[PDB]
Each structure stands twice: as structure tokens, then as C-alpha cells.
Amino acid sequence: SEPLVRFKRSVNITKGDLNSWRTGTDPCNGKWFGIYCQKGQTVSGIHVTRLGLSGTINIEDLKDLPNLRTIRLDNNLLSGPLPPFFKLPGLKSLLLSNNSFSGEIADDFFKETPQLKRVFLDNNRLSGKIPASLMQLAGLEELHMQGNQFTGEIPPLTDGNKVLKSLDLSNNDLEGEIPITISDRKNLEMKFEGNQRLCGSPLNIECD
Ligand SMILES: *[C@@H]1O[C@H](CO)[C@@H](O[C@@H]2O[C@H](CO)[C@@H](O)[C@H](O)[C@H]2NC(C)=O)[C@H](O)[C@H]1NC(C)=O
Ligand SMILES: *[C@@H]1O[C@H](CO)[C@@H](O)[C@H](O)[C@H]1NC(C)=O
């Protein structure tokens, strides 16, 4: 569990240090900063933030951690397309706040990620239509996508979801009627401000 983690460290970091993720030491000894471990034995989360990570994530390295469940890479400089996080089958928490990931996410990106409870993609530069499969996750509880450049209509949310309690789509450029699959729910903190073109809604604008 040491060599793949330091494959992942060896991309591009511009602010701060390892320090350290030594290749010949166990990452659950308690010295490895920013690592979480199930039961003091195996790696289950990566939590590294504000290091100016400017390189590229190679998810084949992260696939060699079989019980990794949480990734939190908030406030770095990661850019390019969104890496294929769907290749990690047990992933529960994907936190990539304030990075610079760009481009359109494949609509089928979340077809085979039923374990995801939390997806924070806010304040990147993602574009082009929220993937419909994201809104088909029955177990998605927290989805924060504010501050991107998403366009098009919001996909409907499946009735199979009974746990979504926080949805933030503010400050994008979304268009259609806000789906009543979302707005009817009485336990859902939802946010849609700063989305001109958007109507229906908890917002006070018809639609039409
Ligand atoms: C994403 O970036 C913003 C900008 O820094 C963070 O929001 C600010 O957070 C500071 C705390 O350091 C607050 O004092 C400001 O009021 C916040 N400003 C705004 C406009 O929200 C935000 O927390 C970052 N997201 C994460 C997860 O760290
Ligand atoms: C990583 O850094 C090296 C030099 O430090 C550079 O050649 C390479 O292009 C960088 N890659 C990314 C994705 O920033």
C-alpha cells in the first residue's frame, strides 16, 4: 500500500511537501499525513488539500487500493478532464472542491458507481449538461456542483433515491424547468440561484 500511493504522489505538487510518504514505510503507521485507514491496517481515504497539486491523477494507481472509499483533493490546481473515478468501485465520497477540472462529463459517467454518497465538484470549470446517470444514483445524499459552467436542463432524479438531503446547483448556466422530482421533496436543502434561464422551481419564476 506504499508504492502505488507514492506513484500517485509523484505527479506534480507545487506548495508543500510529502512529508513524508516514504516508499519503505507503512501508510497506516500514523505518520502519513492526509491518509485514512480502516482498522489501522488498510488505506481507505486520501485527504490532501492546499498543496497546489498541478499534475494529473492516474486512477490506475488508486485502483490498487482495494478498500479506498474516500477521496478529498480540495483547493488545489488540478485541471484537464475529470479523471475516470468510476473505475474505483467502492468509492463513497468524491470531494474535489475548488479545482480547475474542465470539459463535459460523460453522461454515463456514474452508471456503475452506486456506492457514491457524496459528490462535491463545486467551483471547477466543468461544462455541458449534468450527466443523467448522476441523478439516477439511489444512494446519493450530497451533490454540490455550484460555480461551474453547466448548461442544459437538469436531469430528473430517480424515485429510488430517498436520501438526497443537500443539492447545490447554484451559479451555473442551467436552462430548463427545475425537475419536480427534485422540488417536491420536503427534506431537501436545494439551491438554484444564479442560474438565469432556469425556471419553475422553488424559484419564483414561471415557466412559462
Ligand atoms: C472554495 O473557494 C471559496 C473562496 O475562497 C471558499 O469560500 C470562502 O471561504 C472563506 C474561508 O476561508 C470565507 O471567509 C469566505 O466567505 C468564502 N467565500 C465565498 C464566496 O464562499 C470556499 O470555502 C472554498 N471551498 C472549500 C470547500 O474550501
Ligand atoms: C509535471 O511537471 C513536469 C516538470 O516538473 C512537467 O514536465 C510536466 O508537464 C508536468 N505535468 C503536468 C500535468 O503538469
Residue numbers in the entry: 26 to 233
Study authors write:
Plant receptor-like kinases (RLKs) play key roles in various biological processes involving plant immune defense and development. PRK3 is a type I transmembrane receptor which contains an N-terminal signal peptide domain (SP), an LRR capping domain (CD), a leucine rich repeat domain (LRR), an LRR C-terminal domain (CT), a transmembrane domain (TM), and an intracellular kinase domain (KD). In Arabidopsis thaliana, AtPRK3, along with AtPRK1, AtPRK6, and AtPRK8, have been predicted as the receptors that sense the AtLURE1.2 peptide. It has been revealed that the AtPRK3 has a vital role in pollen tube growth, plant fertility, and plant reproduction. Here we present the atomic structure of the extracellular domain (ecd) of the PRK3 (residues 20–237) from Arabidopsis thaliana resolved at 2.5 Å.
To gain a better understanding of PRK3-mediated pollen tube development, we have crystallized a protein fragment of PRK3 spanning residues 20–237 in space group P42 with two PRK3 protein molecules in each asymmetric unit. The AtPRK3 ectodomain contains six copies of plant specific LRR repeats ranging from 23–25 amino acid residues. The ectodomain forms a single continuous structure in an arc shaped conformation. There are two pairs of cysteine residues, C53 and C62, C224 and C232; they form two disulfide bonds in the CD and the CT, respectively. Two N-glycosylation sites are identified on residues N37 and N123, with only one visible GlcNAc sugar residue conjugated on N37 and two such residues on N123. We believe that the exposed N123 glycosylation pattern on the concave side of the PRK3 ectodomain can form hydrated branches and are likely to facilitate the association with other molecules. There is a positively charged electrostatic patch on the concave surface of the LRR domain, whereas the C terminal region is mostly negatively charged. Therefore, we can safely suggest that the positively charged surface will provide a favorable interacting surface for negatively charged proteins. Our size-exclusion chromatographic analysis of the recombinant PRK3 protein further supports the hypothesis that ecdPRK3 remains a monomer in solution. The PRK3 ectodomain contains six LRRs whereas SERK family members have five LRRs in their ectodomain.
